[PDB]
Amino acid sequence: SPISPIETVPVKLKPGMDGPKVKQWPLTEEKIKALVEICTEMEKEGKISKIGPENPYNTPVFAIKKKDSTKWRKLVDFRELNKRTQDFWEVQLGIPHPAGLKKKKSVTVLDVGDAYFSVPLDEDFRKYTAFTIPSINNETPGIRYQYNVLPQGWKGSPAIFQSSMTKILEPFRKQNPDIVIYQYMDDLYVGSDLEIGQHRTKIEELRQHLLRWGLTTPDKKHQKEPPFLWMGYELHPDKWTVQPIVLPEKDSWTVNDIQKLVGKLNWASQIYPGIKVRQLCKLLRGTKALTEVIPLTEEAELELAENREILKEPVHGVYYDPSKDLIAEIQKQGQGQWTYQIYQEPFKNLKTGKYARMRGAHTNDVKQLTEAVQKITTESIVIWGKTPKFKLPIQKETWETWWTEYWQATWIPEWEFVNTPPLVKLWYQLEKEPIVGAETFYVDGAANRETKLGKAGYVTNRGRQKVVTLTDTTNQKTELQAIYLALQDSGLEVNIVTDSQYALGIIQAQPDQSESELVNQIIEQLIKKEKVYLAWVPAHKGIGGNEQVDKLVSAGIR
Amino acid sequence: ETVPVKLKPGMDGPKVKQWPLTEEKIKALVEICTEMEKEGKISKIGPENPYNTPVFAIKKKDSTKWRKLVDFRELNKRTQDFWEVQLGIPHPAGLKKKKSVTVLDVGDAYFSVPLDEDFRKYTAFTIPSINNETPGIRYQYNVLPQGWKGSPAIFQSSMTKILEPFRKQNPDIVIYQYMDDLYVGSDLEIGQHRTKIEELRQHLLRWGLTGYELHPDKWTVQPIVLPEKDSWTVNDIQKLVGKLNWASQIYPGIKVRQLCKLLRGTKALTEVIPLTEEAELELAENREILKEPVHGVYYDPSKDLIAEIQKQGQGQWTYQIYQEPFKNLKTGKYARHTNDVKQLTEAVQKITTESIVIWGKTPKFKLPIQKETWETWWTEYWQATWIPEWEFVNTPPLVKLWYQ
Numbered sequence: 001s002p003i004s005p006i007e008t009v010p011v012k013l014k015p016g017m018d019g020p021k022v023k024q025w026p027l028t029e030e031k032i033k034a035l036v037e038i039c040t041e042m043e044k045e046g047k048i049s050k051i052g053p054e055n056p057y058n059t060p061v062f063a064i065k066k067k068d069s070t071k072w073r074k075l076v077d078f079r080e081l082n083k084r085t086q087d088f089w090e091v092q093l094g095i096p097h098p099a100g101l102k103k104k105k106s107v108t109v110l111d112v113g114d115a116y117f118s119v120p121l122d123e124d125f126r127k128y129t130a131f132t133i134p135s136i137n138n139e140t141p142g143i144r145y146q147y148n149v150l151p152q153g154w155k156g157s158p159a160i161f162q163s164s165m166t167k168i169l170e171p172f173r174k175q176n177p178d179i180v181i182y183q184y185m186d187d188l189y190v191g192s193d194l195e196i197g198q199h200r201t202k203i204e205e206l207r208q209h210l211l212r213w214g215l216t217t218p219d220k221k222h223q224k225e226p227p228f229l230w231m232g233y234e235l236h237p238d239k240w241t242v243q244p245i246v247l248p249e250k251d252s253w254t255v256n257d258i259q260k261l262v263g264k265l266n267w268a269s270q271i272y273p274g275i276k277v278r279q280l281c282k283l284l285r286g287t288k289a290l291t292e293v294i295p296l297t298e299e300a301e302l303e304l305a306e307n308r309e310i311l312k313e314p315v316h317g318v319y320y321d322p323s324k325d326l327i328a329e330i331q332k333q334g335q336g337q338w339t340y341q342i343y344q345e346p347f348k349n350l351k352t353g354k355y356a357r358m359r360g361a362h363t364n365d366v367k368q369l370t371e372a373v374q375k376i377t378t379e380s381i382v383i384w385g386k387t388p389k390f391k392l393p394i395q396k397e398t399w400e401t402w403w404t405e406y407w408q409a410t411w412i413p414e415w416e417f418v419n420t421p422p423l424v425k426l427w428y429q430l431e432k433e434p435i436v437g438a439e440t441f442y443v444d445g446a447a448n449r450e451t452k453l454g455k456a457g458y459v460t461n462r463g464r465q466k467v468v469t470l471t472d473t474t475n476q477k478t479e480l481q482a483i484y485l486a487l488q489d490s491g492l493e494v495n496i497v498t499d500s501q502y503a504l505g506i507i508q509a510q511p512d513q514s515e516s517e518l519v520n521q522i523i524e525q526l527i528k529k530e531k532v533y534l535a536w537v538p539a540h541k542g543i544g545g546n547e548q549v550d551k552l553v554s555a556g557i558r
Numbered sequence: 559e560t561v562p563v564k565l566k567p568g569m570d571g572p573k574v575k576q577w578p579l580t581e582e583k584i585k586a587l588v589e590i591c592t593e594m595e596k597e598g599k600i601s602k603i604g605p606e607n608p609y610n611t612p613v614f615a616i617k618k619k620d621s622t623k624w625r626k627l628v629d630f631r632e633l634n635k636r637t638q639d640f641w642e643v644q645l646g647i648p649h650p651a652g653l654k655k656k657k658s659v660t661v662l663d664v665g666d667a668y669f670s671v672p673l674d675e676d677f678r679k680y681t682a683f684t685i686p687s688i689n690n691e692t693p694g695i696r697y698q699y700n701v702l703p704q705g706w707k708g709s710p711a712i713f714q715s716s717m718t719k720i721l722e723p724f725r726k727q728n729p730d731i732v733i734y735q736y737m738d739d740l741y742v743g744s745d746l747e748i749g750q751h752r753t754k755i756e757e758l759r760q761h762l763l764r765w766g767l768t769g770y771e772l773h774p775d776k777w778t779v780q781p782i783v784l785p786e787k788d789s790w791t792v793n794d795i796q797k798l799v800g801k802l803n804w805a806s807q808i809y810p811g812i813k814v815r816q817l818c819k820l821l822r823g824t825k826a827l828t829e830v831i832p833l834t835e836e837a838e839l840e841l842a843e844n845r846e847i848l849k850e851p852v853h854g855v856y857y858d859p860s861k862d863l864i865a866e867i868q869k870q871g872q873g874q875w876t877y878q879i880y881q882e883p884f885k886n887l888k889t890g891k892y893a894r895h896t897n898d899v900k901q902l903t904e905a906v907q908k909i910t911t912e913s914i915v916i917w918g919k920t921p922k923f924k925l926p927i928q929k930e931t932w933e934t935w936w937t938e939y940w941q942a943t944w945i946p947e948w949e950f951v952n953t954p955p956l957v958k959l960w961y962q
């Protein structure tokens with residue numbers, strides 16, 4: 001096999017460290033024989049070279065037989081060398097997404113053979129790779145070899161190979177700007193817009209260019225044919241999709257079956273719109289053993305059935321046209337679940353996806369919708385280099401009211417309202433000014449850190465009063481209870497004063513959903529009112545009303 | 559001849575990840591870097607360089623030309639000993655006193671100075687590609703790189719020579735170099751100041767280096783402001799003791815006892831009240847008290863500065879700079895087709911530049927925004943050649959009002 005003429009990547013061990021010196025474990029005679037055969041063959045091919053006992057480095061070797069077969073393989077345990085080798089730059093920083101692939105008349109898949117073996121290893125680094133085929137039991141010095149090419153399993157290989165294949169392809173990429181070459185691991189994806197003619201031909205000058213460099217590739221007849229199965233996808237010439245998704249019908253479901261299930265659904269979610277996974281994931285919470293069986297919940301069952309239906313019939317995605325624009329559409333699916341589709345031409349999707357996220361404890365659809373827009377935006381830049389134009393289910397006034405008054409800076413790129421229910425809205429607004437002729441509840445909460453006992457109450461100004469006891473609470477929990485209380489006993493309009501910045505904060509953000517039922521109970525209330533005003537005061541500052549709810553709740557607590 | 563740089567003992571180079579860029583910014587960077595390489599400023603590197611610094615493209619300040627911006631925030635933290643307490647550049651106390659300060663870009667100076675061969679690898683940066691189509695284009699610097707604090711540290715002696723004639727001739731002009739910029743302050747009438755700048759650009763120009771006006775001595779307070787009103791409500795008093803109460807502890811000598819007493823028993827919020835005049839002595843004592851500096855608060859050179867920003871609405875933003883909470887060294891506001899990100903980027907830059915003028919250092923910002931949003935968007939509006947440190951926060955309900 002050719003061993004590339006290419007220049008060498010200088011390599012180094014990690015500062016203050018010297019090459020490995022690991023002892024070879026005595027081997028069986030059959031194993032020693034197997035290796036001697038494999039090694040003499042590799043040496044014949046240039047791949048390895050014999051050395052003396054002056055080189056003091058060593059990495060263990062082993063010989064693994066076959067499952068079904070009668071061949072032998074040599075395994076080198078490069079763990080120690082790896083742990084001493086300098087760090088390299090990261091190979092690839094992401095993988096291409098098919099939805100980002102521009103359509104080309106012809107594409108051919110070329111896989112380099114014996115990739116690592118086709119590339120030389122830094123001459124001064126070769127020593128550190130020394131290994132020994134031990135002799136029959138104790139007696140006799142072993143046979144010592146060292147690598148000349150990039151060894152399988154060593155830290156720098158994937159990186160060095162890729163750099164080499166970058167340097168080698170350059171020249172040809174100059175005199176061939178119109179041709180697309182994807183470099184993925186030890187594969188090359190070559191596509192052009194010519195007629196098979198200058199293509200089947202151009203792909204031949206390419207191979208030739210590679211051979212001058214020690215790199216062998218397949219030839220027509222061996223060259224893969226479309227639809228390319230790659231990385232879980234099916235690349236046809238005018239569409240793409242995920243590879244066959246089969247959902248197991250099953251009596252009992254174990255944790256392990258659901259995990260695999262959730263996984264396939266998530267993968268299908270990139271092209272099948274509407275896939276939901278929430279109810280199925282809930283079942284994976286706190287989970288027991290991998291083999292433990294889990295009785296599907298009714299919601300989990302309805303989620304499942306809905307998924308099989310989406311999956312009955314196939315769906316595909318289109319490739320990318322750089323001239324047209326990107327449109328992203330999002331929809332609220334429910335329980336914090338969102339779904340989107342990206343297209344350039346109405347309803348011919350490049351891709352799909354979903355957003356669940358719980359960015360916080362208490363939140364709302366308006367914040368959620370804008371988290372989803374960010375996630376999609378980032379994603380677009382990654383796949384296409386530009387942002388999409390959005391069509392969101394939120395009225396342009398809801399957004400404006402929300403953005404404008406909210407404390408945090410936000411900013412949705414270019415968008416437009418599209419009337420697809422459920423529509424995103426705020427379910428309540430707090431007055432900006434005290435409601436005249438409405439009762440003013442002055443609320444308070446307190447808890448004994450020692451007994452974890454609390455009291456929550458209010459003293460209004462219409463003479464009313466109240467105090468409830470709570471058992472394993474906190475100051476936070478009692479302060480929210482006191483507000484809830486005040487909201488239960490007050491009717492359509494209320495002014496509420498608290499000295500809790502915490503409950504204030506939560507409430508002023510218009511949450512519509514929370515991890516705390518107490519918080520959800522308050523929400524249900526806030527939505528029922530006609531008008532609620534809410535204000536804050538310092539505590540332990542003898543403030544009219546404050547020092548009064550403060551004395552009530554303090555008693556029996558502190 | 560190069561000066562040797564040694565990372566602080568124990569630290570390794572930066573392995574910061576490159577955020578994603580849009581096709582247009584990528585193409586712009588590919589051109590820029592293709593030219594720098596021809597000129598020999600940077601050279602393509604190998605897999606054997608594990609280091610990495612983010613790179614961006616900005617359109618500068620009122621410009622149509624794409625400029626490359628390298629983020630050496632991490633590399634600067636790890637070289638802090640060399641550029642700060644080894645090759646330090648003294649910050650002039652007089653600068654903030656001047657009536658006019660003009661900022662000039664001096665970053666093209668560094669390109670004529672080679673970088674110590676053993677340090678180059680740390681300046682690695684990558685031009686990503688779209689959809690991970692190809693591997694990114696990797697490069698490293700051969701010359702003093704703009705954005706790195708070690709560049710002016712090194713270039714110090716040469717800047718000194720370049721400026722000596724201009725300095726000898728205009729003894730009352732203050733010139734301060736912070737990173738890629740020159741800050742030039744004078745007490746000259748504006749036409750004479752602008753004229754002296756032009757003169758200085760001519761000197762700069764004979765050495766290869768090829769502005770915008772601040773008025774530091776006019777930088778004033780954003781005193782906590784208490785309302786002046788006729789016929790108060792419990793609500794307004796409550797709010798008043800609230801604001802008043804927080805303003806204390808930060809403001810040495812505030813009082814409210816007079817005010818509390820008016821708030822007695824549980825009376826409706828919408829209930830007007832007559833004010834007792836002694837409460838008015840506090841109002842006027844605090845008011846007169848508030849319209850002053852803090853007393854006790856001094857900048858400590860060894861500590862980091864912090865900046866907090868609050869969104870007030872209507873294109874209005876407030877800020878405070880301090881090293882210890884409530885111990886504000888300065889406070890101010892920034893006012894604005896601008897969305898919040900744009901306005902926030904503009905405030906960040908304005909605060910940073912005042913911070914450079916007053917202390918010779920940038921603050922670490924607490925930004926009331928979502929990391930991702932901020933991250934995808936800032937570059938769109940950034941025009942400075944530096945980048946301060948930041949972190950994300952959620953403004954506390956109270957804080958904002960107390961600063962309105």
Ligand SMILES: N#Cc1cc(Cl)cc(Oc2cc(OCc3n[nH]c4nc(N)ccc34)ccc2Cl)c1
Pocket residue numbers: 096101102103104105106107108109180181182189190191226227228229230235236237238319
């Ligand atoms: N296996 C595999 C594989 C993996 C990747 Cl990430 C890229 C690739 O090549 C292309 C695939 C392209 O997709 C669009 C397209 N145009 N023509 C095609 N013909 C096919 N048989 C499959 C896809 C395409 C375009 C250019 C190219 Cl080069 C092949």
